[PDB]
Amino acid sequence: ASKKVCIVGSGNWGSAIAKIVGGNAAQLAQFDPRVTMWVFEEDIGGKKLTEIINTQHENVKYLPGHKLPPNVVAVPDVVQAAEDADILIFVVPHQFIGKICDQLKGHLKANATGISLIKGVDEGPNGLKLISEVIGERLGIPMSVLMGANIASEVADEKFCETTIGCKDPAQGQLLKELMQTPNFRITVVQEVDTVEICGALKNVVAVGAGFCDGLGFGDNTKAAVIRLGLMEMIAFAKLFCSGPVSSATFLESCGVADLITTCYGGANRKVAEAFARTGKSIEQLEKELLNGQKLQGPETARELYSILQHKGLVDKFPLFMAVYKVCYEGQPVGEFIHCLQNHPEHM
Amino acid sequence: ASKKVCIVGSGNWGSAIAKIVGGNAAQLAQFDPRVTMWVFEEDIGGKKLTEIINTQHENVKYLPGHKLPPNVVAVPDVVQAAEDADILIFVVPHQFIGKICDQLKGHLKANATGISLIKGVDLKLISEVIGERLGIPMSVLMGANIASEVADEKFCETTIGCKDPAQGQLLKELMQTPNFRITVVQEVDTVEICGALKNVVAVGAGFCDGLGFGDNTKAAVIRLGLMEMIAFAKLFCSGPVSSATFLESCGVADLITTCYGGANRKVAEAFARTGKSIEQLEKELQGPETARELYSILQHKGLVDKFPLFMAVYKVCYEGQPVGEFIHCLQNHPEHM
Ligand SMILES: NC(=O)c1ccc[n+]([C@@H]2O[C@H](COP(=O)([O-])OP(=O)(O)OC[C@H]3O[C@@H](n4cnc5c(N)ncnc54)[C@H](O)[C@@H]3O)[C@@H](O)[C@H]2O)c1
Numbered sequence: 029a030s031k032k033v034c035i036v037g038s039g040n041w042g043s044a045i046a047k048i049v050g051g052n053a054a055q056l057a058q059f060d061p062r063v064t065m066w067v068f069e070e071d072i073g074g075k076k077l078t079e080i081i082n083t084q085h086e087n088v089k090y091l092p093g094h095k096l097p098p099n100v101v102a103v104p105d106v107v108q109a110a111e112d113a114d115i116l117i118f119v120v121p122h123q124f125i126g127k128i129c130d131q132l133k134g135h136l137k138a139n140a141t142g143i144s145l146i147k148g149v150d151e152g153p154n155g156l157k158l159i160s161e162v163i164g165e166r167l168g169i170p171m172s173v174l175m176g177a178n179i180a181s182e183v184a185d186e187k188f189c190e191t192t193i194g195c196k197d198p199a200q201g202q203l204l205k206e207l208m209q210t211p212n213f214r215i216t217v218v219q220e221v222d223t224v225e226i227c228g229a230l231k232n233v234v235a236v237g238a239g240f241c242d243g244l245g246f247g248d249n250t251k252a253a254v255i256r257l258g259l260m261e262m263i264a265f266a267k268l269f270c271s272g273p274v275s276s277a278t279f280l281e282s283c284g285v286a287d288l289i290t291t292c293y294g295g296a297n298r299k300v301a302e303a304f305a306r307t308g309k310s311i312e313q314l315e316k317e318l319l320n321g322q323k324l325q326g327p328e329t330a331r332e333l334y335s336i337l338q339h340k341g342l343v344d345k346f347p348l349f350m351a352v353y354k355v356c357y358e359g360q361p362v363g364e365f366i367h368c369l370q371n372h373p374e375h376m
Numbered sequence: 377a378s379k380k381v382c383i384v385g386s387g388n389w390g391s392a393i394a395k396i397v398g399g400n401a402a403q404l405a406q407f408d409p410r411v412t413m414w415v416f417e418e419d420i421g422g423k424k425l426t427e428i429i430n431t432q433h434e435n436v437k438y439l440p441g442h443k444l445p446p447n448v449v450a451v452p453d454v455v456q457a458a459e460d461a462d463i464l465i466f467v468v469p470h471q472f473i474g475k476i477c478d479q480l481k482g483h484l485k486a487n488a489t490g491i492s493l494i495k496g497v498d499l500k501l502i503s504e505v506i507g508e509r510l511g512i513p514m515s516v517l518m519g520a521n522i523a524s525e526v527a528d529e530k531f532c533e534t535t536i537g538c539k540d541p542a543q544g545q546l547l548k549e550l551m552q553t554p555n556f557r558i559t560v561v562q563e564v565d566t567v568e569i570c571g572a573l574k575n576v577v578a579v580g581a582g583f584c585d586g587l588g589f590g591d592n593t594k595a596a597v598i599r600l601g602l603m604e605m606i607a608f609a610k611l612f613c614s615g616p617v618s619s620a621t622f623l624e625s626c627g628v629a630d631l632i633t634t635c636y637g638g639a640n641r642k643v644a645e646a647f648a649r650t651g652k653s654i655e656q657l658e659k660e661l662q663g664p665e666t667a668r669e670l671y672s673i674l675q676h677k678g679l680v681d682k683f684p685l686f687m688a689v690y691k692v693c694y695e696g697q698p699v700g701e702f703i704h705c706l707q708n709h710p711e712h713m
Pocket residue numbers: 037038039040041042066067068090119120121122124127145146147148178179180181
């Protein structure tokens with residue numbers, strides 16, 4: 029009768045989302061109050077982390093200081109967590125989604141549906157592959173996405189922000205909006221899944237360019253042009269690459285312009301790009317110094333874009349994306365970045 | 377045969393444009409190389425400013441240290457400057473364009489056209505003021521750019537709004553350089569209204585900074601402000617309006633740079649942080665004034681409730697509403713209904 033929800037993931041973001049979804053499932057009649065959350069088990073200094081969560085109602089490791097609602101139940105086995113869910117909320121690091129889908133494949137409730145909160149992009153036959161497609165194809169369920177200018181710490185703290193839900197099915201879109209929306213977490217539902225999703229990968233390429241601007245000492249008007257041309261390349265690339273409908277207007281949603289802006293004024297891609305431009309240190313060197321060795325996604329995405337556009341003969345139509353690639357991997361002097369924007373397709 | 381250009385105005389902005397325009401007018405066969413610039417005569421240490429420009433080719437008061445192309449001729453009488461021009465570039469401060477137009481009226485060439493670079497509104501668009509008094513087709517140039525940066529050839533872009541496609545390509549040819557990139561669109565009114573409405577959003581963004589909110593909250597305020605800009609334009613502008621025009625420099629880019637750096641944001645932040653008045657911050661903004669005008673026309677249309685960001689700025693500036701309510705006013709926004 030009422031729809032059962034499983035939150036597949038329990039990290040910083042998954043626990044922030046638990047707070048909201050646990051809250052709204054308990055409140056709202058149409059949702060089963062019992063919300064399962066799959067927790068990868070960890071020795072929390074002796075006690076099982078899933079034990080600590082069900083007793084203390086606090087993800088002491090990944091969202092310390094916050095009270096997860098009591099109707100949210102940690103479950104160490106993902107199949108047991110999801111077996112009865114009508115709605116699956118995928119919120120794990122991209123690196124673990126494959127494993128989780130492998131365990132879940134063939135164990136879901138009939139007509140179960142999913143929504144991916146996983147930002148970024150995967151690899152596929154067409155070069156880039158959307159994570160929501162990896163999930164939906166492996167599990168055989170219809171997929172929505174949730175993407176926007178938001179971060180777990182602020183969503184847990186109830187700091188005002190918005191997000192975009194991409195869902196092809198209007199009725200399912202409205203259901204997901206009811207599950208996730210609060211006075212400080214505002215949702216717009218749009219029908220273009222792929223377009224909402226591809227923004228999250230492309231925005232980080234634009235952020236590398238924005239960081240180059242900061243590191244080369246350009247002003248805000250130059251930077252605003254880099255961001256805007258970057259947005260226009262996002263639109264043009266989605267229109268040529270995405271299946272499903274692509275509208276310019278979708279880029280004016282939170283997943284598009286707002287996430288772009290926040291990523292270009294703060295975030296690891298911008299920060300490392302600026303340091304690269306200022307200091308001549310390699311992306312690799314800065315990754316070790318600043319991100320404990322984490323791979324920065326902006327440069328890696330630019331490399332994938334380069335291969336896609338080379339096979340289509342369109343490298344010259346995306347000068348900002350391709351300047352990020354050439355600066356990061358082919359030793360193009362970062363100081364020439366702006367020159368690559370002086371004959372842009374948008375101004376032809 | 378070749379088109380004659382007059383730059384009506386000679387401040388920082390008009391001098392910066394004269395650098396660009398004089399160069400392109402000399403190089404391109406389709407333009408007459410003799411570019412007039414109307415220069416309000418001033419005495420600079422005993423010599424006339426116009427004489428200094430015509431011998432040293434430097435506006436020593438408003439753009440010192442920059443050479444103007446020698447084919448730009450400073451002319452002190454605005455009628456003499458404009459009377460043979462086919463293209464007039466209006467680049468004076470808002471407060472004078474009314475008087476300048478009253479002197480020019482009737483004295484222009486028959487087929488003459490205009491482009492207004494005067495950002496901000498009169499609510500009535502300044503290019504409408506000009507085009508209706510002078511009787512000439514009007515275009516606009518608006519984007520994320522400032523005069524000092526254009527003078528220094530720092531990369532930036534701009535939008536030209538021009539209804540006639542042939543006139544638009546000529547204006548683009550007159551103005552475009554490697555560091556001043558132009559997109560021509562045909563929605564004149566949409567381009568121009570952005571310049572006024574962006575300052576309302578900027579005040580809101582400054583409130584957001586002053587209240588201690590982060591970049592994800594500021595990005596929502598900017599984005600909701602952009603949606604209200606689009607909605608208002610479709611409801612106000614007698615000319616056509618598409619959301620796609622707001623992806624141009626005049627829309628999203630100018631909005632971003634104003635909301636991250638500009639007078640409206642700076643004051644609004646300090647006011648929300650310290651509760652320092654406004655004026656004492658001022659001394660120590662067109663955004664609020666525009667908000668007031670928005671309130672008035674939204675009443676007439678019956679749509680005050682559909683623009684809570686615009687109205688929260690007005691109410692917080694003019695009706696005592698506590699700045700601290702600004703974010704609350706966005707928690708049931710039409711975009712999320
Ligand atoms: N953190 C944010 O602010 C934020 C905001 C928007 C979107 N997102 C997206 O949400 C996704 C997840 O981010 P996060 O903040 O929850 O990261 P996290 O590192 O905080 O999450 C840790 C979780 O990863 C899983 N995990 C850890 N080790 C594992 C292992 N050996 N095997 C299997 N699973 C393991 C567990 O579920 C663990 O709870 C990402 O795709 C990110 O893009 C995050």
